[PDB]
A paper describes a structure:
Proteins that perform these functions include [name]/IM30 in photosynthetic plastids, [name] in bacteria, and [name]-III in eukaryotes. Here, using a combination of evolutionary and structural analyses, we show that these protein families are homologous and share a common ancient evolutionary origin that likely predates the last universal common ancestor. This homology is evident in cryo-electron microscopy structures of [name] rings from the cyanobacterium [name] presented over a range of symmetries. Rings have an inner lumen that is able to bind and deform membranes.
Reconstructions were also generated for the other six symmetries and complete ring models built. Rungs are maximally constricted at the top and bottom with internal lumen diameters of 14 nm and 15.7 nm, and widest at the ring equator between rungs 3 and 4 with an internal diameter of 17.5 nm. This unique asymmetric curvature is a feature of all Vipp1C11–C17 ring symmetries. The analysis of different ring symmetries, ranging from C11–C17, provides us with a view of the structural flexibility that enables [name], [name], and [name]-III family members to perform their functions. Furthermore, as each ring comprises between 5–7 rungs stacked together to build a dome-shaped architecture, these asymmetric structures provide us with a glimpse of the structural features that enable filament tilt in the context of an [name]-III-like polymer. Based on the Vipp1C11–C17 models, where helix α5C is positioned at the tip of the spike, α6 helices likely coat the ring outside surface and do not contribute directly to polymer formation. Consistent with this, Interfaces 1 and 3 linking the top two rungs were poorly resolved in Vipp1C11–C17 rings, indicating a weak interaction once the limiting geometry is reached. When membrane was modeled into the Vipp1C11–C17 structures as a 4-nm bilayer, sequential constriction was observed with the membrane lumen reaching ∼3 nm within Vipp1C11.
Numbering used by the authors:
A (entry chain IC): 156 to 219
B (entry chain B): 105 to 155
C (entry chain B): 1 to 52
D (entry chain A): 26 to 155
E (entry chain G): 53 to 104
Write the structure that this text describes.
Amino acid sequence: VRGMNTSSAMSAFERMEEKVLMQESRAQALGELAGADLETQFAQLEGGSDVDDELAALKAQMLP
Amino acid sequence: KASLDTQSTQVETLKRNLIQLESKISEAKTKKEMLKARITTAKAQEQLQGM
Amino acid sequence: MGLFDRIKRVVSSNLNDLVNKAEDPEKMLEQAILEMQEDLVQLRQGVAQAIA
Amino acid sequence: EKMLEQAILEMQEDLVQLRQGVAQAIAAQKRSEKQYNDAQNEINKWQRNAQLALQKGDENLARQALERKKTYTDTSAALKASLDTQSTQVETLKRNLIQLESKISEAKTKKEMLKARITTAKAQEQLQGM
Amino acid sequence: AQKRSEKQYNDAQNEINKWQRNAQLALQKGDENLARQALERKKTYTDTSAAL
């Protein structure tokens, strides 16, 4: 109940937390860096431009 | 009788503690499943992120 | 203190090598759940004796 | 980070030792109280005996009982004095533990701050290489 | 590190809200000492949050 250093419950939570926190933080940070780059941002804008022209073409195709 | 009353109270406290302990262990089992999923996702993400 | 300085350097080197091997998440999780269940059984036996 | 990690492990073990001392102090207070309680109970029994002795007509026994009560009272007074001194020490120990609990949390916060500055310094070093 | 501090700060804020609810509950309960203790805990949390 007090929570001794050698107690299994206290030790397990601490060990699990350190490993879990580092892994989660690192994965999120790595993903963010890719997003930060200008080229990636440009691609998203290009994609938006790309979908609308196709839709217009699709409308023309399905018009008759 | 005096000894019995003191002992009985101690026994009751121990029983209460056991019930509390039971709740805690069950929670830990649930946590492991959640923890495993998070770890797997991070590992996959790291390899992808580097590329 | 000279002894204190020596102790810190030796302890740090030893601790770093040791922690990495046992820091894997999967091994730690399996060990923790098994230990608590065993403890409960032992506690119950003690409680049972008191009740008896 | 290595210096910080070693320190954190060390502080936790020290706290446990302090807790054990506090428990002993708590036990000591209880033990003195029990002795004091026992003395009071003993005094009551002695008082009953003295009254009984008077009815019996044995003057010497009654006088002896009174002397015993005085000795018990003196012992009780000594125990009470000891308890008061012990209580002040116990309060200080309890206060120290509370202060220590606040301190360990602060230490954890300090480590995060320390880690951030070190990383920044490393980044500066990279610029020099370029 | 920034994310970790934010999470801790967020956790502290969440903890404070829980503490506030408990203090209100404590007043309804009539236990004055518990409510006072909760307020002290909130102050400590606030100080920690400020440091963060």
